[PDB]
């Protein structure tokens, strides 16, 4: 009962997209299944993932059921300049100044992208490198996300900051205690009205 | 004297600003006051610029007389809310028997009308979120997100937007608030435009 | 040793990464440093990229040398400015008699020039704002919009733009900003890239 997680457009709104099937193909993530994203202008939302490059061996990682707005990008840490001194690229240019690449230990390295399980972003949203964005979050529309949000906070702005926890701290535990999306989908099929209203935790 | 309000493309030779009101005409729940322009980004008309406006969740915009409306302005009104008392994933959206899971209007968060002002200017590129109100005289400065409501004759800026400061003191926006320059007949106003621009209209 | 800073596209068949010089050295009202570049974004020009930069209002633009400049930044001039003493509204631009009305440059309001200075890394999808000075070595994270200024090697994001951190102890700033190695003879600097990459220039 419900759509097919593994139908690039499980709508018969050809803008709403299964991004676990799409982005399957891709090197260093891992993507839960039912998660979507409403494309903006028809891109499907691999070309939303920016800077993603196997050798700096960086992870991204996407939950189940998660709400991902039109326009919405990752930037992975394919981007970073090298720090400790100039950020002129002086490499990029060649003429010999191709000997100054920069080695694999000479770049920031942020870490992975973790987004959870249950989490909505917002239109036009920005995840820069690094971040961990816990299950249940939501973050508003045109965010810059640059610092992990825990989980079940409402964030927003740029740079994102939590503005606050969408329930009582005792309901988050017991929503994170259970993972009903981890359950099989036969009892989340059971379970959808309580689940939308919390009434799942007791 | 000036131009029409009700003619789309005022400006002979610059068809990149739009009076809203003519445009906007044929949209259900939206109100728009004479002589405020959109300056478009790459020709698209205003309409395009609101979003998630469904005549289902009953929600309006209304924007005053004499706004500046820079390229790229946005306005999202509550279509693209969440229910969020407990999950945020629409289920009912994909159908196969999920559609059950419909929320019914008043599950919905109903963040409010959105009301912008008159004689206010936005700047370019600004989204402006559901729910929210524009006084009189404002100015949000461009890029703005603008999430809470903004006072009359403030300038605020930021995302999420911040009120920065007054933009004359509050004797002076006391005054301009009373007296409503903008809701003159335009054969008034035109008597008036010199001391409508620097302020001695108070006096 | 190095690239040709007079080439608008330095890597032969690469249209991606531009020299911004030798693109904006046509402008009046600009000045930019060799070897400071642009990522496109879709394979625009950087003078694309300039907004609102109108000969008459004599605001000035300076880059430094070594910038690194992100795909989509824009730079935001003097020419969206509105004139503020009263009514934003511009009534002039409509003519139809409203012509009258044009302000005159001193009624409008003059931010200042804007100048980025060397080795400033600005990231991807910034907008500098009108008047803005960024100082030398300083780094702007993506997405930022800068409305002041920004001392030298500082990191700083936002919008509004804030500083977030110095990069690099004041000893070691005092040190950078005292030899200024992109200033030095190109022979010179090529000899020692390698000291300026990690900052053991100073030593």
């Known amino acids: 009962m419900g759509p097919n997680p593994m139908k690039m457009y499980p709508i018969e709104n050809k803008s709403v ?3 676990k099937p799409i982005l399957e193909k891709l090197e260093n993530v891992e993507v839960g299944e039912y998660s979507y994203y409403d494309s903006k202008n ?3 939302f691999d070309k939303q993932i920016l800077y993603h490059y196997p050798i700096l061996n960086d ?4 939950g189940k059921f998660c709400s991902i ?3 919405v990008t990752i930037i992975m840490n394919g981007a970073n300049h090298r720090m400790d001194g100039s950020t002129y690229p002086f490499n990029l240019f060649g003429n010999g100044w191709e000997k100054h690449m920069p080695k694999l230990d000479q770049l920031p390295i942020k870490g992975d992208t973790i987004i959870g ?8 949203v920005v995840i820069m490198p690094g971040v961990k964005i816990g299950d249940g979050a939501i973050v508003a529309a045109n965010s810059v996300v ?13 740079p994102a900051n939590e503005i606050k926890q969408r329930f009582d701290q005792d309901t988050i535990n017991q929503l994170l205690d259970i993972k009903w999306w981890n359950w099989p989908i ?4 059971e379970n959808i009205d309580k689940i939308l209203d919390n009434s799942i935790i007791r």
């Open 17 to 19: 997209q299964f991004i």
């Open 42 to 44: 028809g891109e499907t």
């Open 146 to 158: 640059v610092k992990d949000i825990a989980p079940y906070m409402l964030a927003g702005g740029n």
């Open 69 to 71: 707005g039109p326009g």
């Open 59 to 62: 992870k991204l990682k996407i």
């Open 117 to 124: 399980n249950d989490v909505w972003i917002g239109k036009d």
């Open 186 to 189: 036969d009892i989340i099929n």
